[PDB]
């Protein structure tokens, strides 16, 4: 699709049979989801945003279907204000900015 | 133009005698610039992201040129680590997400 920006670019994602709403976020390198359970091993990581640093759990090679498009990649889980889809997965679905 | 997301979507903006590098950020409602001593009235504001909130100064009707596209709107100035072009100006320069 083509998505304009007068509203937040929120889309439905599928991650483990679970549907969630997430924000397409070109200013985020990484995909960060609110606290949830995901299967498999994770690694403790820290990431920094506009307000400072948080602890997250890094899950690698996780399938995420984003508005009907498939990605498989890294998902960070932790106290983000909102679910965000970052560039690591936006690139996989062929997302670009255009003006 | 089309901007892929393999790297951070940094572009040149101008606000005064300052050309600056800034992220084209679809996850940002508002435009947030690194500390700069802009003239005119402003209002205090708090904005929140990963890590928590920061205090910023809200300046209205500030002309901002983004990649040779003119815009004019609200700019928030404060201790952000990166200049962020948010949706309030991205819409004015005709920016969309596409996949
Ligand atoms: C609530 C959703 C987002 C987390 C909001 N952020 C925009 C993000 O794109 C943010 C931009 C940013 C901020 C600081 C440093 C770098 C980039 N990206 C973000 O938090 O990315 C996390 C991954 N980080 C780690 C370092 N580089 C990254 O890309 S935000 O910068 O916090 C923000 C919040 C409010 C606002 O106006 C009201 C404008 C911007």
Query: Domains plus CATH for chain A?
Result: 1-99 (2.40.70.10)
Closest CA to ligand 1's atom 19: A28
Q: Which H or E run includes B88?
A: helix B87-90
| Known catalytic membership, residue A25 | yes
Please give the C-alpha separations between residue A19 and each of A9, A35, B43, in angstroms, as whole numbers.
Answer: 16, 14, 39
Give CA B77 to chain center in angstroms: 9
Closest CA to A34 of A50, A4, A7, A13: A13
Compute the distance between CA of residue A42 and CA of residue B41 in angstroms, rounded to an integer: 48
Please give the C-alpha separations between residue B61 and each of B39, B73, B89, in angstroms, as whole numbers.
Answer: 12, 4, 11
Cα(B95) to centroid of ligand 1, in Å? 18
Please give the C-alpha separations between residue B1 and each of A17, A71, B64, in angstroms, as whole numbers.
Answer: 37, 25, 18
Give CA B36 to chain center in angstroms: 13
Cα(A20) to centroid of ligand 1, in Å? 20
- Is any Cβ of chain A less than 8 angstroms from the Cβ of B77? no
Please give the C-alpha separations between residue A86 and each of A33, A39, B20, B77, in angstroms, as whole numbers.
Answer: 10, 21, 23, 24
Judge whether A64 and A73 are in contact, CB under 8 Å. Answer: yes
Question: Residues of A with CB below 8 A from B69's CB?
Answer: 99
Closest CA to B30 of B52, B62, B2, B70: B62
| Helix residue ranges, H only, A1-99 | 87-90
Resolution (A): 1.4
Judge whether A54 and B50 are in contact, CB under 8 Å. Answer: yes
Q: Which H or E run includes A73?
A: strand A69-77
């Amino acid at each position: 699709p083509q998505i304009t920006l007068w509203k937040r670019p929120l889309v439905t994602i599928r991650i483990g049979g679970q549907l969630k709403e997430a924000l397409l976020d070109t200013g985020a390198d990484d995909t960060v989801l609110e606290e949830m359970n995901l299967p498999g091993k994770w690694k403790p990581k820290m990431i920094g945003g506009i307000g400072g640093f948080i602890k997250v759990r890094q899950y690698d090679q996780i399938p995420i279907e984003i508005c009907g498009h498939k990605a498989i990649g890294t998902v960070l889980v932790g106290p983000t204000p909102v679910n965000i889809i970052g560039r690591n997965l936006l690139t996989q679905i062929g997302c670009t900015l255009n003006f």
